[PDB]
Design a protein around this ligand. Structure first.
Ligand code: ICS
Ligand code: ICS
Ligand SMILES: [Fe+3]
Ligand SMILES: [Fe+3]
Ligand code: NA
Ligand code: NA
Lengths: 476, 522, 522, 476
């Protein structure tokens, strides 16, 4: 280890051409507890090298698929050709309660379906007519967003003018979002673009409203997209602790929830990467403080509840211990059953912008060890937080190439890999148990105490499955 | 809460009372939700003929399309060639979506790369992306060929694929003799099948346009088969099987069957099988070229007839009884091989199945959608079974295609109540199945949301989905199925009749209410 | 009443108000029906653990058996031989039932004859029935062989089959050299599979017992395959396919695959394909004999070992991954042929499907029944998938067999909650699925009435049926399926996972209630 | 062609051995307009010739499968080995209203499951223990029947002693039925045996009872509610003003049977299976009986008028109201389907009634029955058959598989109506086939509502596109 890790990296990079070679070496590092500032250890948030099969998506995915799409009582227009909206239709499990097609629209695909005529003449006229048709056929929508795809900016359309005009003509919230896929280097910029769209076009709507009845325990869940219900299994704990969750951004979120968030006493930020922008803005303008928390596993959940409760009075802190005491026997039974079946097994992670570090505590609560992790699009501030959670001599890969991840796994030989759909079937063929850590492999929730039970069940079912000892035919 | 020995996933966990109360508290407090009576009222309105007329007046808005963009097809086409890496010149987001989209349908790895064009390339072009991309791709993943398409970004700015590739070789980024076929695949033109057409024709001319001098039609005594956009493994296999059975020499041009179904034996294989470069080089020496899906292979046909001088025969997709017959008869004529006893018997076995099941299929009304060649083959076979294809929807169809399908309907009494729709989407279809309710839908996984909507109106109004097409994401391993030839017709018949009987059992399962008709024998 | 353009069959015709009122008047007027509250009370009682204990104390009453009588198996065995007429010495009613029973499963003609013994044959014997029967059968239907079994009437009175056939030939009713193998098949012994064993061993003795002198084990370099009672066409075909793939010479002894699937081409073929008389004559010269279903081929095994001197290998039914492996390895050892790349890849394709689908299959609890070899093969494969075979019921199983299955369960953690039941029927099983509810049933069509009963208790208590086994009367063309080998394992896996996913879609189809988990991707 | 028909018969019989030949020639005749005594034309109700593949069943099928099994609130024991009960379980669609397994048991299979021990020791002890177990597990049963299979009589069991003893001990109706399959020559004797079982053990129960009678009380005798046939017949009779006290035995209850001696008139559909009990009820209770026919509008109208003529002017007035009500309905059926079926020739082979009873319905659609025959009819049925069949028709009694095949190859009808053992033979020959026992899982066919289904069914099959595809285009 350590020296064999550094040796593995240089070995893998011997296949690249000189230019890629040098760049990829900047995004591959081995952790070290005597270094605290990641800016001295690894580079991140840079362009992908051409032709190396990055796992990243685009800015459109960061805005439409991640931030805006989950908001349920709004209609989101994928403005451009037909592809982007179709590939992202209902592929992400941002769960919600609603009557789809009537008052909620998350799993539908609204699109302007750019033909070549709209390329040469522009799509602003078509957008305005499109907005009118949405009003006719979906009267109960509470706002519209326009998610710009690659061609919109390239041809000089002005969707903000269309948004302003039709908004006034209809007395409707129409949000223009310039998340063209060629902008930025990954989904990350789509987060930032989308945050500023919320600020500029939605969040200020009720600055002069005084009809909201506030309590000292009002709070908002920022940056939880309710994958498989993750946000519901977190909200339950917060309100058992005595808090009132005014808003959920944006998992199962309504536009009205967004609008009421400037009225809360505290912003609870799960996904720092995708939502730290709007959080900082709400502190500056409304004086609302924000704090990071972690609801992966009992250890991090207990600690989060106590830190959150410390921001309020003794009555919330008493309820905090009532919740911890209530669920204690439940997660203890989970570990008593599943920790023996998983202890000492090594895990490698590769996910997006938060979970590569955020789920470590839950694996260790099951006796497992994360020997390697990495992000598609995180920034150096995420990597600062990652080193405090990752073990000594861990392997760290930013924007890992398909070749790199394969070769790294061939040598480390982990017992489990947690990554995305484009990686899943590669490593299954290699005989390595795999768990989807975006979609939860269509299971979950994984947040909270109720999520830990499902998480422990899911890791055990896959790692210990009888299929894995059958990869080799008895006759060679 | 959780009971350690009976853990609940999202369903039915959130049906617990404490979650139910919490969710109701969230709604009443901060969601400012429309009242339920209003939601009910609007839903009922969305099922009316009045709503349908407004729905079909749409011109600018598309809701729930039944098509994808060109480069998705160019990728699938390129995957059918030996040790070939699909390469999409443009933005990386599309490639992540293409891979993911195919990942979920085949439940397999899908290898495809981008050259990650960004804001800098949006003003100066992707030339440098192409040179570093091709060199990085060849060195890292070691393909024998790189098949290049474009994202809509690269098309809008105007990147010259041919010039960019030529410069990459001239400047030494990739060996001069390394094959790099290319095709422009604009997303704002056509659909995913047009990308397949464009990619294939691009590969075919790369290996043959400049080498026609020594070519003699028929000299290799084979028949070329061009499958087109095809997402059923069984459809590649049945064609090769029937031709081997007939003793017909053939070259299946674009064959991803191996790479889309590699074994799980402890090692990952990025490449497997596929059409060889020599099969493409030698294809003009074939007796002829058969197009399995002609209505999205127009560009290919022009090149094969214009340059290879083949006389591409006029054959429908080999779906159902009549068109599989015609396919086999035309192959026999071209190759001189007689249709063998084994296929004749298989045909008679399909007919026997039809006679056994015709009483339950007769008069059954269907809504259906998909790509043009698949849709018309499905329409043809339903007519042969005595079914009524009431709602025929092909979002990426054209007027010429619609005219041919209408002629097929007009030639059968079971097409009397049928209508063909082009350029319409699954929100259009949703109205049709409310206003003119069929018995079943035949379509891809997106139809499951139309079934959910119909059930909400009432159990008696529910239109169950039968999953045939692409993509199918909510069932496992149906991509192994077959829809072409007698084998595919036999599989489709069984699926249809048993979906009918499964629904009948459900409607007659009520003890002492409807189970007087819950027969053991059907 | 009827509307001419929307005619109603029994369902839903009799739900019309005037029929509903008519039926209520009939009940209240003349049926003296128990009041509904009493019916409800008794029904709920039949679902209790208390009722189960009384139910399992039965000794004399059998309710809803999962087995049939011997001669049904003798008929199926005889149908597997070339131009062979099955002939059941005894009463004609049984033969009408045998044909009808098989008619409905295969949806095909089933040729079988009786000699119509009546009250008169009960005092003098059926000798004259046999003499006229054999002569009438040979002349009218022109078989090359007549395979004789018995009805329980002929067994009780004591007709000597051997003497009766010998006398028929001596007195000139049939040519001396005309083959007439026979077997006693008493219905009050064993079950339908015992009849298969008895008939086969009878045919094997007819063609070899007196000709062993010139026999040399291995001299023909083939392997004999005895399939046993088998009602899936694909199971005959997959075995022949895998052996041809390996280049293994073989003789499939009893092969009804052709006669049970003749084409519909304008002519009826009473006979088709089948094992030849000569393959039976020459079978002792094989290297060895493999028994695909040993647990109902005990009599056969003794004869091939006692008379043919073959060393029948100890192989389980080739079902699932491990037992298909062992089957292929033992065949390789006997034949000296290596397992080819195509079967290795097929195996790895099955494993890939297992890894793809294991998250939805894991922990799923099943109740299941059928014949012994089929049941233990299904149990083995479920354990391999990570499923729990909770209720294992084999009505015609024995203590030795139950002990072997228990050892299989004990060797896996997924057999911890499993119980094996022998001599119990589907009314016993009905209790088990109420008191210890599984997730699904795997069984034949008789299980549809267990599903109906569970739904009546409540939707949350419903146990859906997955149809695998025999007989299947309420779906079309599932007899073409495969359950053996990797192919059969792939089909069973697909059916199981998608039955799970279909049920999940149904439970999450509720708009705004449960459809938060109505995922597009599974 | 008359002379070509006789010639076809002699030609077909040239394959038989001398004995069968001579016998089979007695069961093959060409109908002729100058004959009332069929015994001068054809022989029937004789033993089947060995080895010729008769379509007949046994006496057990005639008693258990046909007569007793449909009675819904009784439990019927198939007493003997396991075969008979399993093959006949729910194969016949005698429909009923009930809660199966609780108060109705039609589609279940109760069996004593004879092992060899019961053969050597006898089954009477097992039967008595079996009856007790039935009482424990099915308390709401209203009686038990014991259907004897082949071994019972051959081994000397006395089920009547068991029935008498257990009946008194339990105060239960326990009917012994000696329908051993070796008795008689076909299902026909099972009918007769079963009728006498009803008379001797059920019908006398209320002689000294438990009843408020009306002058319009009537019973439907010999309709087994195949697909609902009896319900779609009862509806018309009660619309005509009658009160159907009982239905024998389709959807019948034991109490209905017991109340039948109280009615004013017995309406006999199936003469063959039920004329025995009808004659007995006339002798002992003075109840008259009449034959009727509800196949097609012509026969149904005529039956209704004949039935009404037995009562007063008020029933006759309602009769015309019923005829007038349904007139436009069946006229629309013929107007649509008669053009699609006229001139097409049909061959029938069924059991004991329908070979003649459905002729009128075919002719109501313009079709012609060119051949018919029974499995087990008697000469009194054949008397009735000649009046319904056309001149020079072909008549076959207990037709052999070879005969039916050869007869069809030469006559070449457009449709064949027969049983399940014949269906798939002729479909392969390219001849449309309709099951005329099970109604091919359709129906009802009785009454006006049944005629619509019948016409729909004949049209869908005869004109189906599958029939023009039997010949491959390259194999002509
Ligand atoms: S938003 Fe982000 S890639 Fe923070 S774009 Fe991505 S539902 Fe990942 S690691 Mo998919 S920064 Fe959420 C994410 Fe994390 S879509 Fe989900 S799983 S916690
Ligand atoms: S009872 Fe008879 S064989 Fe009259 S034994 Fe048979 S339900 Fe047939 S011609 Mo199946 S004398 Fe009924 C009959 Fe006719 S079983 Fe049904 S159709 S009208
Ligand atoms: Fe896979
Ligand atoms: Fe068939
Ligand atoms: Na796109
Ligand atoms: Na029997």
């Amino acid at each position: 280890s350590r020296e064999e890790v550094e040796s593995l990296i240089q070995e893998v990079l011997e296949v690249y051409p000189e230019k890629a070679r040098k760049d990829r070496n900047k995004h591959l590092a081995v952790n070290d507890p005597a270094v605290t500032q990641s800016k001295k250890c690894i580079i991140s948030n840079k362009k992908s090298q051409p032709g190396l099969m990055t796992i990243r998506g685009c800015a459109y995915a960061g805005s439409k698929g991640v931030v805006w799409g989950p908001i349920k009582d709004m209609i989101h227009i994928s403005h451009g050709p037909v592809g982007c909206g179709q590939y992202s239709r209902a592929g992400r499990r941002n769960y919600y309660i609603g009557t789809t097609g009537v008052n909620a629209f998350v799993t539908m695909n609204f699109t302007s379906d750019f033909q070549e005529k709209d390329i040469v003449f522009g799509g602003d006229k078509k957008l305005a007519k499109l907005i009118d048709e949405v009003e006719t056929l979906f009267p109960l929508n509470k706002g519209i967003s326009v998610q710009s795809e690659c061609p919109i900016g390239l041809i000089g359309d002005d969707i903000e003018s269309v948004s302003k005009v039709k908004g006034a003509e209809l007395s409707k919230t129409i949000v223009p979002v310039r998340c063209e896929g060629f902008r930025g280097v990954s989904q990350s910029l789509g987060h930032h673009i989308a945050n500023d769209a919320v600020r500029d076009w939605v969040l200020g709507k009720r600055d002069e409203d005084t009809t909201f009845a506030s309590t000292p325990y009002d709070v908002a869940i920022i940056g939880d997209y309710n994958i498989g219900g993750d946000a519901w299994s977190s909200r339950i704990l917060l309100e058992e602790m005595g808090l009132r969750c005014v808003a959920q951004w944006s998992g199962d979120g309504s536009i009205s929830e967004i609008e009421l968030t400037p009225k809360v006493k505290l912003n609870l930020v799960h996904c720092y990467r995708s939502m730290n922008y709007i959080s900082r803005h709400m502190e500056e303008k409304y004086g609302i403080p924000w704090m990071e928390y972690n609801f992966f596993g009992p250890t991090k959940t207990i600690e989060s509840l106590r830190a959150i409760a410390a921001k309020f009075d003794e009555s919330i802190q008493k309820k905090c211990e009532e919740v911890i005491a209530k669920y204690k026997p439940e997660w203890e039974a989970v570990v008593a059953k599943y920790r023996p079946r998983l202890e000492g097994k090594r895990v490698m992670l590769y996910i997006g912008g938060l979970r590569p570090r955020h789920v470590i505590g839950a694996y260790e609560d099951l006796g497992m060890e994360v020997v390697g992790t990495g992000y598609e699009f995180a920034h150096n501030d995420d990597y600062d937080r990652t080193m405090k959670e990752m073990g000594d001599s861990t392997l760290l890969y930013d924007d890992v190439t398909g070749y790199e991840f394969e070769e790294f796994v061939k040598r480390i030989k982990p017992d489990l890999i947690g990554s995305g759909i484009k990686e899943k079937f590669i490593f299954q063929k290699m005989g390595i148990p795999f768990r989807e850590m975006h979609s939860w492999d269509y299971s979950g929730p994984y947040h909270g105490f109720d999520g830990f039970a499902i998480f422990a069940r899911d890791m055990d079912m896959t790692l210990n499955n009888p299929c894995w000892k059958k990869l080799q035919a008895p006759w060679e | 809460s959780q009971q350690v020995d009976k853990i609940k996933a999202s369903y039915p966990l959130f049906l617990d009372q404490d979650y139910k109360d919490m969710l109701a508290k969230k709604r009443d407090g901060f969601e400012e939700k429309y009242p339920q009576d209003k939601i009910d009222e609007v839903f009922q309105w969305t099922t009316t003929k009045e709503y349908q007329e407004l729905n079909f007046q749409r011109e600018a808005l598309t809701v729930n399309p039944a098509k994808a963009c060109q480069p998705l097809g160019a990728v699938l086409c390129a995957l059918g060639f030996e040790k070939t890496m699909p390469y999409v010149h443009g933005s990386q987001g599309c490639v992540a979506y293409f891979r993911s989209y195919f990942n979920r349908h085949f439940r397999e790895p899908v290898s495809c790369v981008s050259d990650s064009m960004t804001e800098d390339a949006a003003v100066f072009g992707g030339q440098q992306n192409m040179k570093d991309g091709l060199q990085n791709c060849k060195a890292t993943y070691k393909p024998d060929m790189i098949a290049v398409s474009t994202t809509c970004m690269a098309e809008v700015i105007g990147d010259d694929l041919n010039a960019f590739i030529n410069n990459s070789k001239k400047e030494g980024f990739i060996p001069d003799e390394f094959p790099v076929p290319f095709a422009h695949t604009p997303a704002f033109v056509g659909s995913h099948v047009t990308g397949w057409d464009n990619m294939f024709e691009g590969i075919a001319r790369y290996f043959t346009l400049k080498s026609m001098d020594d070519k003699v039609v028929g000299s290799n005594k084979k028949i070329n088969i061009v499958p087109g956009f095809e997402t059923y493994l069984g459809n590649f296999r049945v064609i090769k099987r029937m031709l081997s059975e007939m003793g017909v020499g053939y070259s299946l041009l674009s064959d991803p069957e191996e790479v889309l179904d590699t074994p799980a034996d402890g090692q990952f294989r990025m490449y497997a099988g596929g059409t060889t470069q020599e099969e493409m080089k030698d294809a003009p020496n074939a007796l002829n070229t058969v197009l399995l899906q002609p209505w999205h292979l127009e560009k290919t046909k022009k090149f094969v007839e214009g340059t290879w001088k083949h006389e591409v025969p006029k054959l429908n997709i080999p779906m159902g009884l009549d068109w599989t017959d015609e396919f086999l008869m035309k192959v026999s004529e071209i190759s001189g091989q007689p249709i063998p006893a084994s296929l004749t018997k298989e045909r008679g076995r399909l007919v026997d199945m039809m006679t056994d099941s015709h009483t339950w299929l007769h008069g059954k009304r269907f809504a259906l959608w998909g790509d043009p060649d698949f849709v018309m083959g499905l329409v043809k076979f339903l007519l042969e079974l005595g079914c009524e294809p009431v709602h025929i929807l092909c979002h990426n169809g054209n007027k010429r295609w619609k005219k041919a399908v209408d002629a097929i309907l007009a030639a059968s009494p079971y097409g009397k109540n049928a209508t063909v729709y082009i350029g319409k989407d699954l929100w259009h279809l949703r109205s049709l199945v409310f206003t003119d309710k069929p018995d079943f839908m035949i379509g891809n996984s997106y139809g499951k949301f139309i079934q959910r909507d119909t059930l909400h109106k009432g159990k008696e109004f529910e239109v169950p989905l039968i999953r045939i097409g692409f993509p199918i994401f909510d069932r496992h391993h149906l991509h192994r199925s077959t829809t072409l030839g007698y084998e595919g017709a036999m599989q489709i018949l069984t699926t249809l009749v048993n979906s009918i009987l499964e629904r009948l059992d459900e409607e007659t399962r009520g003890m002492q209410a409807t189970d007087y008709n819950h027969d053991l024998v059907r």
